[PDB]
Design a binder for this molecule. Structure first.
Ligand SMILES: CC(=O)N[C@@H]1[C@@H](O)[C@H](O[C@@H]2O[C@H](CO)[C@@H](O[C@@H]3O[C@H](CO)[C@@H](O)[C@H](O)[C@H]3NC(C)=O)[C@H](O)[C@H]2NC(C)=O)[C@@H](CO)O[C@H]1O
Length: 563
């Protein structure tokens, strides 16, 4: 049911054959605790514009004869009656015992967004892609589609730099074309649901970055999603010098990267406020990382935090680093699954865990080597559960499921091998999240905007603007569709998400009233701003920082229903 809490986990297609990933396969998924599994990743084909597999062998061909498929201590065999093998066979086989766990195919990701740029160029290509998604979920027994386009933004040089040859020429239209993509997917998926007697889902994982969001002008697409997953992680990392939290929850005035900003933006709660402009809390999921980022040779800070470093952590502190040329030399990133950091702490008593009571996340600091790594533990899970309950969030998504921890069957005392430590992957944090989501009960239904309860007036209020970080210059066009002049002194109100701060109205007067996740802005015009019948007047002003949209628009205490 719609208001049930959700615990959504991303499954990595590439993990089962990789030492650093722990050889994690579908039978290692936390099936008793997740409500949804997002298979990562499918992509778009450059020549046909259809959904396509990345590692086809892993997805539908691997027989796992060289790997260990077992669950609850019982050997899992591939279902020999299915016309495919691979992860997809194991997913369908497990789902027979977990029929209420929804399976979605995630399309895109950091390295799989490239061909979205050309597929969105025309409506016929979007239609082909959307139809191919329907065919795919039917063929492979999926319950829905997750779109992970990184990113449909005009912000220059956002997304993967390998794709700038496609994204940079398209910046002005990306957001508009993405809105058409999501709407078309919803239309086709809903038709397939009716035809099949099944309730198929459409979701998206979306940016939490104020930098990316400055280039997003239309968040209407959110209304077409079953839920919207905020990527409230990768806030900080080895791409810059700011030794700060990967995935803080609450705004932290000591985050050195944002100390000059209007408010601290690199935390879940800022993105929550941003997206409340277009969605109720129960349709929003918090993103939770089961991986780390970090730095070495950290200068300054306190236990590293708020320090500086031009050298991301390497070596044993970076087992998930990329090998983008080859021969085992990994790009420094301080990137690890949580179980590996636990094992490092077993090995080194001076690698210690600390708690940030402002951001409500932990971190790990080696004071002799000056190594800082982000972390996630039972205390931060508990803080996240508290936030989910307090804010009425729909639940959480997790990147990525092989990073949770449990006891290692292959532990070897004294061994430094990646998969011979005390811990390997497991379900400790995921079970803790699941138990907490069960205990807090279903979400409340957020009430409709109050403007709908007001008496109607045939006035149209259109809110537009332009963003030049950190300044949003708004223009409101007010059209009088009644048969009488509206005298000057009229007022318009709107609810502005608390991701932004109203700064000034350029004409008339204004007031700001606290209203939950919003401030209600009331603009009162001057006596001279009469609105003749069938005419339009425009008023302007300035807002600091960005917001997904405005809500609850009123005019002279009535609901402006236009013409
Ligand atoms: C035009 C201009 O100078 N704009 C400034 C912004 O760049 C800056 O925001 C920061 O932008 C960088 C990218 O240039 C962001 O880093 C990226 O972060 C993502 C994850 O969020 C990571 O995947 C990328 O690898 C990384 N790229 C690079 C090149 O480092 C950074 O997170 C942004 N920080 C914030 C707080 O938004 C803002 C800062 O306010 O200033 C603009 O003037």
């Amino acid at each position: 049911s719609e208001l049930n809490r959700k615990l959504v986990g991303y499954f990595p297609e590439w993990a089962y054959s990789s030492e650093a990933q722990g050889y994690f396969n579908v039978t290692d998924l936390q099936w008793d605790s997740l409500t949804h599994i997002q298979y990562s990743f499918a992509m778009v084909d450059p020549s046909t514009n259809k959904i396509t597999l990345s590692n086809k062998h892993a997805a539908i061909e691997e027989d796992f004869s060289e790997f260990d498929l077992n669950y609850n201590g019982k050997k899992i065999e591939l279902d020999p009656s299915l016309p495919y093998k691979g992860h997809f066979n194991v997913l369908q086989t497990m789902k027979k015992n977990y029929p209420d766990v929804s399976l979605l195919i995630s399309v895109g990701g950091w390295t799989g967004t490239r061909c979205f740029y050309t597929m969105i160029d025309t409506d016929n290509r979007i239609n082909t892609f959307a139809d191919s998604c329907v065919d795919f979920i039917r063929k492979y027994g999926f319950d829905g589609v997750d779109i992970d386009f990184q990113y449909p933004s005009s912000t220059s040089q956002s997304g993967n730099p390998d794709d700038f040859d496609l994204s940079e020429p398209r910046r002005t239209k990306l957001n508009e074309r993405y809105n058409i993509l999501i709407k078309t997917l919803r239309e086709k998926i809903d038709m397939a649901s009716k035809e099949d007697g099944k309730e198929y889902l459409l979701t998206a994982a979306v940016t939490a970055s104020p930098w990316v969001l400055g280039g997003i002008s239309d968040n209407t697409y959110a209304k077409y999603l079953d839920f919207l997953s905020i990527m409230s992680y990768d806030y900080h990392g080895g791409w810059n010098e700011y030794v700060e939290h990967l995935a803080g929850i609450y705004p932290n005035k000591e985050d050195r990267e944002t100390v000059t900003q209007i408010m601290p933006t690199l935390c879940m709660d800022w993105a929550y406020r941003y997206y409340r402009g277009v969605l109720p809390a129960e349709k929003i999921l918090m993103g939770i990382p089961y991986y780390t980022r970090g730095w070495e040779n950290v200068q300054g800070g306190i236990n590293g935090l708020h320090g500086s470093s031009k050298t991301p952590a390497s070596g044993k502190y970076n087992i998930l680093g990329d090998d983008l040329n080859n021969d085992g030399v990994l790009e420094p990133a301080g990137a690890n699954p949580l179980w590996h950091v636990l094992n490092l702490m077993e090995q080194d008593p001076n690698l210690k865990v600390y708690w940030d009571e402002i951001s409500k996340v932990p971190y790990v600091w080696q004071n002799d080597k000056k190594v800082f790594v982000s972390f996630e533990n039972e205390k931060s899970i508990d803080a996240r559960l508290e936030y989910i309950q307090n804010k009425n969030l729909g639940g959480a998504l997790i990147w990525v499921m092989n990073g949770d921890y449990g006891l290692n069957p292959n532990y070897v005392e004294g061994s430094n091998k990646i998969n011979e430590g005390k811990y390997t992957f497991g379900d400790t944090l995921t079970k803790r999240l699941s138990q907490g989501l069960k205990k807090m009960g279903v979400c409340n239904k957020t009430p409709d905007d109050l403007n709908i309860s007001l008496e109607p007036i045939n006035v149209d209020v259109k809110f537009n603007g332009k963003y030049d970080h950190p300044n949003y210059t708004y223009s409101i066009d007010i059209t009088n569709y009644t048969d009488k002049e509206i005298k000057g002194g009229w007022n318009v109100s709107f609810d502005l998400p608390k991701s932004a701060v109203f700064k000034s109205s350029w004409g008339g007067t204004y007031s700001v009233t606290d209203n939950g996740d919003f401030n209600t802005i009331t603009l009162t015009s001057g006596a001279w701003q009469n609105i003749a019948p069938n005419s339009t007047i425009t008023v302007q002003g300035m807002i600091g920082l960005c917001f997904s949209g405005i809500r609850n628009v009123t005019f002279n205490g009535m609901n402006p229903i236009g013409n």
